[PDB]
Design an enzyme around this catalytic site. Sequence first.
Site, PDB file in Angstrom:
ATOM      1  N   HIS A   1      73.667  91.512  57.432  1.00 52.34           N
ATOM      2  CA  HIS A   1      74.504  90.592  56.853  1.00 52.34           C
ATOM      3  C   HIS A   1      74.668  89.817  55.386  1.00 52.34           C
ATOM      4  O   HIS A   1      73.176  89.811  55.129  1.00 52.34           O
ATOM      5  CB  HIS A   1      74.559  89.737  58.058  1.00 52.34           C
ATOM      6  CG  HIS A   1      73.479  88.639  57.796  1.00 52.34           C
ATOM      7  ND1 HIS A   1      73.304  87.123  57.700  1.00 52.34           N
ATOM      8  CD2 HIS A   1      72.031  88.645  58.838  1.00 52.34           C
ATOM      9  CE1 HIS A   1      72.261  86.635  58.242  1.00 52.34           C
ATOM     10  NE2 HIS A   1      71.576  88.050  58.964  1.00 52.34           N
TER      11      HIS A   1
ATOM     12  N   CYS B   1      67.024  90.362  61.004  1.00 56.47           N
ATOM     13  CA  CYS B   1      68.522  90.659  60.741  1.00 56.47           C
ATOM     14  C   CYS B   1      67.731  90.996  59.088  1.00 56.47           C
ATOM     15  O   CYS B   1      66.927  91.237  58.635  1.00 56.47           O
ATOM     16  CB  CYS B   1      69.610  90.216  60.892  1.00 56.47           C
ATOM     17  SG  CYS B   1      69.758  89.590  62.469  1.00 56.47           S
TER      18      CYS B   1
END
Length: 238
Positions: A195, A213
């Site tokens: 992301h 992440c």
Amino acid sequence: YGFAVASVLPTRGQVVGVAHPVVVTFSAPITNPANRHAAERAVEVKSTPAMTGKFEWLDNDVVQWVPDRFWPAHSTVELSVGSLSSDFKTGPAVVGVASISQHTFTVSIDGVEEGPPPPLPAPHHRVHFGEDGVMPASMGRPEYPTPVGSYTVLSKERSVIMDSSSVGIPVDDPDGYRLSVDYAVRITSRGLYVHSAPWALPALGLENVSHGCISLSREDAEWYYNAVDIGDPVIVQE
Ligand SMILES: [Ca+2]
């Protein structure tokens, strides 16, 4: 009819990334784990080209067959699942490789590393590698590392709210967080994403500071998001 199949993914004629699993949804739960081997035989996956794979049960009524290799890109794959005949299509092979030690995310399209054109003023300045497709990234800190493994893109979403409760920290807890994430490529059911992380710019290419992440700049995330499809593979390695 205990092993009656309601539906299969990919749908007929669907365009998918090159690691998309074959997902078999049953009309009723198979709650007895001992019956799952007979169910797996009833939904035997036969593809053209031939492909080996492994079954993983996602729920009592959903089993997915994970191919051991990538499907050929730009192709029509014929699919039989327990006499049910289908087919689907693959787009380009859009592969992303995250390197924890290099702090990089390398994107290739059909084997050719590629990324977005570079910006004349990104900020004051920023790490950029000059090698095609090599994006500077930040993986998980040692307390919340990015797990090594082979993943596939499960979904793509914009402006999604990401909450610290996904890693075991309440929002209002001191080290918690609540972020709005511009581009979000989900790679695990538990909430791992590639992301955009604009607040994390100084760490990209240098330090692993996320909570698991794979963090990218907004521009690198936008380009990868726009290139990748659900089912494409993401590899995390040391
Ligand atoms: Ca698709």
